[PDB]
Amino acid sequence: TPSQKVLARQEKIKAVALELFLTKGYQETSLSDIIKLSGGSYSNIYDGFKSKEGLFFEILDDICKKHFHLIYSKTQEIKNGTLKEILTSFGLAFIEIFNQPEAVAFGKIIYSQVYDKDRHLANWIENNQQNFSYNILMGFFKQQNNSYMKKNAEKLAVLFCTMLKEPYHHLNVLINAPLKNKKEQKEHVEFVVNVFLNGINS
Amino acid sequence: TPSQKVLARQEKIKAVALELFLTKGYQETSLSDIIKLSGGSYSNIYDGFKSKEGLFFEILDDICKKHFHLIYSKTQEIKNGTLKEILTSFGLAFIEIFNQPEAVAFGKIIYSQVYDKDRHLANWIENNQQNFSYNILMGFFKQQNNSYMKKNAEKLAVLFCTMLKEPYHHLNVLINAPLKNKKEQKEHVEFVVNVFLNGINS
Ligand SMILES: C[C@H](CCC(=O)O)[C@H]1CC[C@H]2[C@@H]3[C@H](O)C[C@@H]4C[C@H](O)CC[C@]4(C)[C@H]3C[C@H](O)[C@]12C
Ligand SMILES: C[C@H](CCC(=O)O)[C@H]1CC[C@H]2[C@@H]3[C@H](O)C[C@@H]4C[C@H](O)CC[C@]4(C)[C@H]3C[C@H](O)[C@]12C
């Protein structure tokens, strides 16, 4: 199929771009480096492919796609679980994802574009909001028969993700702070989930 | 006094460096730009002054100094306040600080050094840990007659700061997301403080 061939060609460009970002560095690599090693599989493929910035985000697209399904799965298959159980389910999958060297390596690439005048990053977030994981949590919240939970559902989703993620991913990215091993991951999830549901007065 | 003169000279270099970072851009400005406009007030002042990186952190030093005292004040003068009251006191001062364009402008400078091979940033955090604000919260926690609060005091301090700060400062920095106006600041503090103390089951 001509369509399959196109997709295959696209997966080729991105795989090259990725290997360069990883091998040579994001800042070091120009589009042309990408076109050269993509050989006759480019010519001009240009839709998210006009710049190395677009390619990175086309790649990040895929990664976030795979992140969602994967978190949705540990979630989808739970037996009428309590809030606690779906909360710690999501948590484990979420936190494991952000303690992979890949989370950090892409993290660094994003942080480095802080002075991008082209603003590819703003567009990406502005136009990929539906594909973020917290929409899963936000979804379970509105299901709950709690007016507080239902009216604050989005803010709560973001708040819980942050609690699990936050000082830590940021320190990983900026100064290469060590990742959490699964034991630590589990610990922190229980910890956060408890404060979150029950608060510290107890 | 010769010492006063030295300090004055130092405040001159940093004030120049700051104006350049703000006016010309951090990445755009080299040490020499700083030395030229500092005129005869440099020659080689070199202790945190050997690089533009050192100057930035010498400046950040001062800013974090002023941030601490200021937060300590809204805190220090409270009448045997409940955890709630010192929590919302700290919160307001903390969150107001991070919704100033200055927080964001320095935020951008830090994020941009993600590929700094000299690692000035790691040293700065590694060697300025005592001067961070959460040490204030960590301090009130250990005072509380709660074994949970006292044994987790540090993790709780960091956790509360994060809840107030986190998706938001990060989005401010990377994509220039809008700041919170004081009304929104207050709202978010009450919100966070409540989940934090009482959890969402209620
Ligand atoms: C918290 C909120 C979205 C909640 C979430 O993590 O799903 C904000 C905070 C930082 C933003 C994130 C990052 O700066 C970019 C990240 C890329 C990751 O692989 C997933 C999305 C990603 C993490 C972004 C999604 C979303 O805009 C983030 C995560
Ligand atoms: C949360 C924890 C420290 C808690 C705190 O904010 O006081 C971590 C997260 C991000 C780190 C911070 C930033 O990347 C650098 C920030 C500079 C700010 O003006 C104050 C400290 C500052 C904010 C850093 C202090 C500390 O290492 C931070 C804040």
DSSP string, B116-175: -SS-HHHHHHHTTGGGSTHHHHHHHHHHSS-HHHHHSHHHHHHHHHHHHHHHHHHHHHHH
Token reading at B99: 């919704």
Indicate the helix (H) or strand (E) that contains A173: helix A153-175
* CA A167 to centroid of ligand 2, rounded, Å: 8
Token reading at A126: 């502005």
Environment class of A156 (CB within 10 Å of its CB; exposed 0-12, middle 13-18, buried 19+): buried
* Cα angle value A152/A155/A156 (rounded, 5°): 80
* Ligand 1 contact via A162 beta carbon (within 6 Å): yes
Could you say which of A21, A43, A59 is where a domain stops? A59
Q: Are A165 and A98 in contact (CB under 8 A)?
A: yes
Residue A1 amino acid letter: T
For residues A51 and A65, membership in a common domain is answered with: no
Nearest to B112 by CA among B102, B121, B99, B101: B121
Domain assignment of residue A97, given as a range: 60-202
For residues B46 and B118, membership in a common domain is answered with: no
By residue count, chain A amounts to 202
B133 among annotated binding-site residues? yes
* Ligand 2 contact via B72 beta carbon (within 6 Å): no
For residues B91 and B145, membership in a common domain is answered with: yes
Q: What share of chain A is helix, strand, coil (3-state, %, to 5)?
A: 75, 0, 25
Closest residue in A to B167 (Cα–Cα):
A162
Closest approach of chain B CAs to the CA of A95, in angstroms? Answer: 15
Token reading at B166: 């986190």
Torsional sign, CA A69, A128, A122, B171: negative
Residues 6+ away with beta carbon under 8 Å from B195: A156, A159, A195, A196, A199, B163
- Rg of chain A over Cα atoms, rounded to whole angstroms, equals 19
B161 among annotated binding-site residues? no
Could you say which of A59, A82, A100 is where a domain stops? A59
Resolution (A): 2.6
Q: Where does residue A49 fall: left (phi above 0), alpha (psi -120 to 50 degrees), or beta otherwise?
A: alpha
Nearest to A154 by CA among A135, A174, A173, A177: A135
Residues 6+ away with beta carbon under 8 Å from B22: B105
* CA B33 to centroid of ligand 1, rounded, Å: 37
A27, A115, A199 ranked by CB distance to B196: nearest: A199
For residues B173 and B160, membership in a common domain is answered with: yes
**Look-up of token digits 């107030």:** B164
- Cross-chain Cβ contact B200/A197 below 8 Å: yes
Count residue pairs from A and B with Cβ separation < 8 A: 103
For residues A49 and A39, membership in a common domain is answered with: yes
A64 among annotated binding-site residues? yes
B115, B121, B166 ranked by CB distance to A27: nearest: B115
Could you say which of B26, B41, B59 is where a domain stops? B59
- Chain CA centroid to CA B47, Å: 22
Measure the CA–CA gap between B85 and B67, rounded to whole angstroms: 20
Please give the full DSSP string across chain B, using - where no structure is assigned. Answer: -HHHHHHHHHHHHHHHHHHHHHHT-TTT--HHHHHHHHGGGTSS--TTTSSHHHHHHHHHHHHHHHHHHHHHHHHHS-SS--HHHHHHHHHHHHHHHHTSHHHHHHHHHHHTTTT-SS-HHHHHHHTTGGGSTHHHHHHHHHHSS-HHHHHSHHHHHHHHHHHHHHHHHHHHHHH-PPPPPHHHHHHHHHHHHHHHHH-S--
For residues B13 and B111, membership in a common domain is answered with: no
Q: How many domains does chain A have?
A: 2
Question: Any CB–CB contact under 8 A between B147 and chain A?
Answer: no
For residues B135 and B173, membership in a common domain is answered with: yes
- Cross-chain Cβ contact A192/B25 below 8 Å: no
Residue B29 amino acid letter: T
The DSSP letter of residue A181 is: P
Question: Any CB–CB contact under 8 A between A163 and chain B?
Answer: yes
- Chain CA centroid to CA B115, Å: 21
Token reading at A80: 């009428």
Output the CA–CA distances (angstroms, integers) from residue B102 to A24, A71, A117, B11, B108, in the order listed.
34, 37, 20, 18, 10
Task: Kindly report the CATH number assigned to the domain that includes residue A162.
Answer: 1.10.357.10
Question: Any CB–CB contact under 8 A between B117 and chain A?
Answer: no
Indicate the helix (H) or strand (E) that contains A126: helix A120-126
Torsional sign, CA B81, B85, B89, B90: positive
Closest residue in A to B108 (Cα–Cα):
A114
The DSSP letter of residue A177 is: P
Token reading at B94: 């903390």
For residues B44 and B126, membership in a common domain is answered with: no
- Cross-chain Cβ contact B197/A200 below 8 Å: yes
For residues B47 and B75, membership in a common domain is answered with: no
For residues B98 and B189, membership in a common domain is answered with: yes
Residues 6+ away with beta carbon under 8 Å from A4: none
- Cross-chain Cβ contact B27/A115 below 8 Å: yes
Task: Kindly report the CATH number assigned to the domain that includes residue B22.
Answer: 1.10.10.60
Residues 6+ away with beta carbon under 8 Å from B24: B33
Measure the CA–CA gap between A192 and A199, rounded to whole angstroms: 10
For residues A81 and A181, membership in a common domain is answered with: yes
Measure the CA–CA gap between B19 and B34, rounded to whole angstroms: 9
What angle in degrees, to the nearest 10, is found between the helix axes of B182-198 and A153-175? 90
How many helices (H) and strands (E) in chain A? 10, 0
What angle in degrees, to the nearest 10, is found between the helix axes of B134-143 and B83-98? 170
Output the CA–CA distances (angstroms, integers) from residue A117 to A38, A61, A121, B91, B176, in the order listed.
27, 21, 10, 33, 12
For residues B80 and B48, membership in a common domain is answered with: no
**Look-up of token digits 């978190």:** A71
The dihedral formed by the CA atoms of B182, A142, A98 and B135, expressed in degrees to the nearest 10: 40
Token reading at B20: 């350049």
- In chain A, which among 63-92 make CB contacts under 8 A with chain B? 83
